[PDB]
């Protein structure tokens, strides 16, 4: 195809459509909605915008996502602590952190860890430190360590602290070794101190679920992963990823 | 999720053809109730806690066994969870009303609701009764015209549960 011919065609359609409207605001709106086409074809003078690549460990596959696929509006709003925000959005980020770690806002039960909230709002500890201390707290041990065997604890901790399902037999193997050896604190420390957490979230960003549209999705754990990214995931007590990767 | 606009756009995009008379009729019907639905959404967003109060009062007056010992709502934790679920239902019904589509309900409430309540032992019929009480209270609060628009999605949730 000829790109110049397409630009001429879109400009001609812009002129024709603007002709019929006979209203200045209408004309400017439709002209903008055609100028977006001209602007995009002009912007793609170099190659198409780079495709987003999710890195992986030698155990699981590395995946790529087209830049077109991500920017459809489904991108999650990342919650970040600037240490200088007003107390309203500070509390907003704190509530988001509680929702992510505990799968729901447990302030509906009046349950919170006040000193950790004060520390994360003041800036003594970062959001990563807050997440790690929140995951090894007494509350998290109650909702997500006691009712479960170590394998399901592993899977739910993956969901809560990395925002994704386990993707390899090696991964569940290593983190089961870590949990079996060191308990909940060791498991949370391994999850949060890893390179993937720092790369995806960093110090100041609350973890989020990295489901469809956010990044490239593995195919080998699709059904199990989207069973896990569901508020009914704690309702299942049988582990599902060790079993899957063994099967 | 989807709304009425996305549904029509996709319906005519898969066919590959412009909007016909039925399409414009659907969009006009959706836009006509838009201001009424936004007013109702503002009322609900402003007075959600009140609606929860009367809905829970009616539910637990009609079924006192729920909050007496041996009932699923008997503890402070389980009572708080019950009223929290009711707030969930009200908020997602408001979302569905503003969207005009029940896709958000299927996606983010019904997907896993039955598993949750059968695992936890929550009585589904009593939850339906609580949703109906919430419907009545919110309809009394937001007016009959917006009451019908609330009630369609409240009925969608109730039929999803039972």
């Amino acid at each position: 195809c000829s790109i110049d011919a397409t630009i001429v065609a879109v400009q001609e359609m812009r002129r024709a459509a603007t002709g019929y409207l006979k209203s200045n605001d209408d004309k400017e709106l439709v002209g903008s909605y055609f100028d977006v086409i001209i602007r995009s074809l002009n912007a793609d003078k170099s190659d198409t915008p780079a495709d987003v690549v999710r890195p992986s460990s030698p155990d699981r596959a590395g995946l790529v996502l087209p830049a077109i696929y991500a920017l459809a509006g489904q991108s999650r709003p990342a919650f970040k602590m600037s240490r200088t925000l007003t107390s309203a959005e500070k509390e907003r980020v704190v509530r988001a952190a509680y929702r992510q770690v505990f799968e729901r806002d447990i302030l509906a039960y009046g349950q919170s860890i006040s000193y950790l909230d004060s520390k994360v709002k003041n800036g003594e500890i970062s959001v990563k430190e807050f997440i790690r201390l929140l995951g090894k707290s007494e509350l998290y041990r109650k909702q997500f360590f006691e009712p479960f065997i170590n394998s399901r604890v592993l899977e739910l901790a993956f969901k809560h602290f990395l925002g994704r399902a386990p993707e390899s037999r090696t991964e569940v193997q290593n983190y089961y070794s870590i949990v079996a050896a060191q308990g909940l604190g060791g498991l949370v420390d391994a999850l949060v101190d890893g390179e993937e957490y720092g790369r995806i979230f960093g110090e100041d960003t609350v973890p989020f679920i990295r489901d469809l549209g956010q990044e490239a999705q593995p195919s080998w754990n699709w059904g199990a992963a989207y069973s896990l990214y569901n508020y009914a995931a704690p309702r299942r007590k049988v582990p599902q990823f060790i079993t899957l990767y063994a099967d | 999720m989807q709304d009425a606009i996305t549904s029509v756009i996709n319906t005519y995009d898969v066919q590959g053809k412009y909007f016909d008379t039925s399409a414009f009729d659907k969009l006009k019907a959706y836009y006509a109730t838009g201001e009424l639905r936004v007013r109702a959404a503002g009322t609900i967003s402003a007075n959600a806690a009140t609606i929860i109060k009367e809905a829970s009062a009616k539910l637990f007056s009609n079924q006192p066994d729920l909050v007496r010992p041996g009932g699923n709502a008997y503890t402070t934790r389980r009572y708080a969870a019950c009223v929290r679920d009711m707030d969930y239902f009200l908020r997602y019904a408001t979302y569905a009303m503003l969207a005009g589509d029940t896709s958000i309900l299927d996606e983010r409430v019904l997907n896993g609701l039955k598993e949750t309540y059968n695992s936890l032992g929550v009585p589904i019929s009593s939850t339906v009764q609580g949703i109906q009480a919430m419907k009545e209270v919110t309809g009394s609060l937001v007016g009959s015209g917006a009451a019908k628009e609330m009630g369609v999605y409240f009925d969608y949730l109730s039929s999803g549960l039972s």
Partner: peptide, 27 residues
């Protein structure tokens, strides 16, 4: 409502605009 009126005007004249562009650039 204004945007829907715009859409109605454009869809009534869709074939005209498409054929006009096609004639402008082709043959």
């Amino acid at each position: 409502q204004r945007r829907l009126a715009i859409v109605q005007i454009l869809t009534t004249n869709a074939e005209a605009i498409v054929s006009r562009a096609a004639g402008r650039i082709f043959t």
